[PDB]
Every structure is written in structure tokens, then in C-alpha cells.
Amino acid sequence: MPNFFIDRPIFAWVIAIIIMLAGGLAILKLPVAQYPTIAPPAVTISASYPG
Amino acid sequence: DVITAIKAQNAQVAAGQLGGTPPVKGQQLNASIIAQTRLTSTEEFGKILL
């Protein structure tokens, strides 16, 4: 339960800074793109019997 | 003699198409040549020029 932190608004403000500092740094190392790995993977065998 | 016949008579050869590989201006037909291909019966095997 809260109530703690009301007597301690610095310790509470501190959490809210770290959580914000953590991610954000994350935003500058997290891979970007449209979709993640979505489609089932496939393997293809290629043969050739000329003629 | 028996063996090397079976090889020659029961082989499978290749040869080109008609057009395909760089053809001469305004060709109109393109098809695939079908040379020798494997004997498919005990019968055909009997007939081997030995």
C-alpha cells in the first residue's frame, strides 16, 4: 500500500525518474521495423536435372 | 559387353530447346527437344543390340 511516499515524496519521485531513465535509453538500442518475426519459416530444396 | 549395352540403351540424353537460349530475330516457335529416355518394361530390356 502507498501512504508511505506521501511522507517521502522524493523517494517516490526517484522511482518515477529511474523507470524513465531506464527505458528511453532502451529507445536508443531497441531494434526497429514494421513487423516482428511473423510468418512461419520455410526451407527450400533446389535440384537440377538438366535437359 | 552386356553391361555397357544396358548403359547405352537405357541412358537419358539432353539437347536444347528451339528458341530459348539466344535466338535469331523474330523466332515464333519455342519447344523442348526430347531425346533418349529410360526403358520402362522387361520387354524393352529384352531388345538390346548386344
Curated annotation (Swiss-Prot), chain B:
Residue pairs linked by disulfide bridges in the UniProt entry: none
Entry's induction text: Positively regulated by MarA, Rob and SoxS transcriptional regulators (at protein level).
Compartments where found: Cell inner membrane
Disruption of the gene: reported phenotype: Loss of susceptibility to contact-dependent growth inhibition (CDI); inhibiting cells still contact the target.
Subunit structure as annotated in this protein's UniProt entry: Homotrimer, with large domains that extend into the periplasm, interacts with AcrA and TolC. AcrA may be required to stably link this protein and TolC. Interacts with AcrZ. Part of the AcrA-AcrB-AcrZ-TolC efflux pump.
Function: AcrA-AcrB-AcrZ-TolC is a drug efflux protein complex with broad substrate specificity that uses the proton motive force to export substrates.
Family: Belongs to the resistance-nodulation-cell division (RND) (TC 2.A.6) family.
UniProt-recorded name of the protein: Multidrug efflux pump subunit AcrB
Protein species of origin: Escherichia coli (strain K12)
UniProt lineage: Bacteria, Pseudomonadati, Pseudomonadota, Gammaproteobacteria, Enterobacterales
Region of the whole protein represented: 202 to 251 of 1049
